[PDB]
Design a protein around this ligand. Structure first.
Ligand SMILES: OC[C@H]1O[C@H](O[C@H]2[C@H](O)[C@@H](O)[C@@H](O)O[C@@H]2CO)[C@H](O)[C@@H](O)[C@@H]1O
Length: 380
């Protein structure tokens, strides 16, 4: 059971959890309540099974896409901020994190992937994916690579896949249709085919993960990488001279990155619901609170209007918001969990040569997605 008179927060390791501890200590200073920030492995998978026990954290921090699934399972406490508080944050930020015509979590900040490039050895970055192969050959002669990024997570390869009209679930107007899937259309296949072509011709390695790709760019071994605002902190200290720019276009069409919204939800089992609300509204979601977190590891464009006006001057955040405009907001429906688990396998198998592109994306749409939806509905 969860301890009453205490707050336990979970947040992913790539975020600024040490900054969240500072606001935690300032909270303990004022209220006498010990805040314990944690960042366990696979917390998005760990939360639901533990929340249904047994119970885990009081607050859970993750992008909005998974929260609608949590809310369906009755895991999240219903929040009630008044309109005075809602006006402090951006309206479209509240729209993401709204499920079933109801608010389920406090949104913190919005985040979208951008092309991060080393401007000392690549002063003129490529505007197209199509230019990268030839650029890689020029750099390989110098003993370096053109592009490296996490291929093990489909969040990073989605931008290219969606560039020519690849989508997850087709909307109508303020709705989504789970029967209508866009992961096996001309645009999705073309996007993935070009990516696997980069692998086939040794311009990028299929086993490249987050850690390896980050190491490569920050050590100065690759010219470009694709990542969000959270990664900027480590590049600053690495002293690599870099810039943040619009993602490469494919067939003249801009890449469409799935835009996320870091949001904090209160556990339904938590006996510290008031303290949770007290912490988030009055300590975290303030200029002072977001500074602490943002200084540790950047959040990107934040939901709080007052503080966002300050950050908007920074050209990195303009480039993040430019990539978000071209991209589109993630759905927050419960099926996004099964979607992500299914697409992940499909992309990996295609990149490893286990399946061909057409085989993987056909299997994804036809069989894999539905099997995954059945897996989580029953016990697994
Ligand atoms: O790769 C699938 C994964 O994508 C998103 O996860 C992002 C997240 O939005 C970022 O905040 C950061 O943590 O990087 C992650 C990529 O590993 C979805 O939020 C997530 O549900 C999904 O499984």
């Amino acid at each position: 059971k969860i301890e009453e008179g205490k707050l336990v927060i979970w947040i992913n390791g790539d975020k600024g959890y040490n900054g969240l501890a500072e606001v935690g200590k300032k909270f303990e200073k004022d209220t006498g309540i010990k805040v314990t920030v944690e960042h366990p492995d696979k917390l998005e998978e760990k939360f639901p099974q533990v929340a249904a026990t047994g119970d885990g954290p009081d607050i859970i921090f993750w992008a909005h896409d998974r929260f609608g699934g949590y809310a369906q399972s009755g895991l999240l406490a219903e929040i009630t901020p008044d309109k005075a508080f809602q006006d402090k944050l951006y309206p479209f930020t509240w729209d993401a994190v709204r499920y079933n015509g109801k608010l389920i979590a406090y949104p913190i900040a919005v985040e979208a992937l951008s092309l991060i490039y080393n401007k000392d050895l690549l002063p003129n970055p490529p505007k197209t994916w199509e230019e990268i192969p030839a650029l890689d050959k020029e750099l390989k002669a110098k003993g370096k690579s053109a592009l490296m990024f996490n291929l093990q997570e489909p969040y990073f390869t989605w931008p290219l896949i969606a560039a020519d009209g690849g989508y997850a679930f087709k909307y109508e107007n303020g709705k989504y249709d789970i029967k209508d899937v866009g992961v096996d259309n001309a645009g999705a296949k073309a996007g993935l085919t070009f990516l696997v072509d980069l692998i086939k011709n040794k311009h990028m390695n299929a086993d490249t993960d987050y850690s390896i790709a980050e190491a490569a760019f920050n050590k100065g071994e690759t010219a470009m990488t694709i990542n969000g605002p959270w990664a900027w902190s480590n590049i600053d200290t690495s002293k690599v001279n870099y810039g943040v720019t619009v993602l490469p276009t494919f067939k003249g069409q801009p890449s469409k990155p799935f835009v996320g919204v870091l949001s904090a939800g209160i556990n339904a089992a938590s006996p510290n619901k008031e303290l949770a609300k007290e912490f988030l509204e009055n300590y975290l979601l303030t200029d002072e609170g977001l500074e602490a977190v943002n200084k540790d590891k950047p959040l990107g464009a934040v939901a709080l209007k007052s503080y966002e006006e300050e950050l908007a001057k920074d050209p990195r955040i303009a480039a993040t918001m430019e990539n978000a405009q071209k991209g589109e907001i993630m759905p927050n429906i419960p099926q996004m969990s099964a979607f992500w688990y299914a697409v992940r396998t499909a992309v990996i198998n295609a990149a490893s040569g286990r399946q061909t592109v057409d085989e993987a994306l056909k299997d994804l749409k036809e069989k894999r997605i539905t099997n995954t939806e059945a897996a989580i509905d029953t016990g697994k």
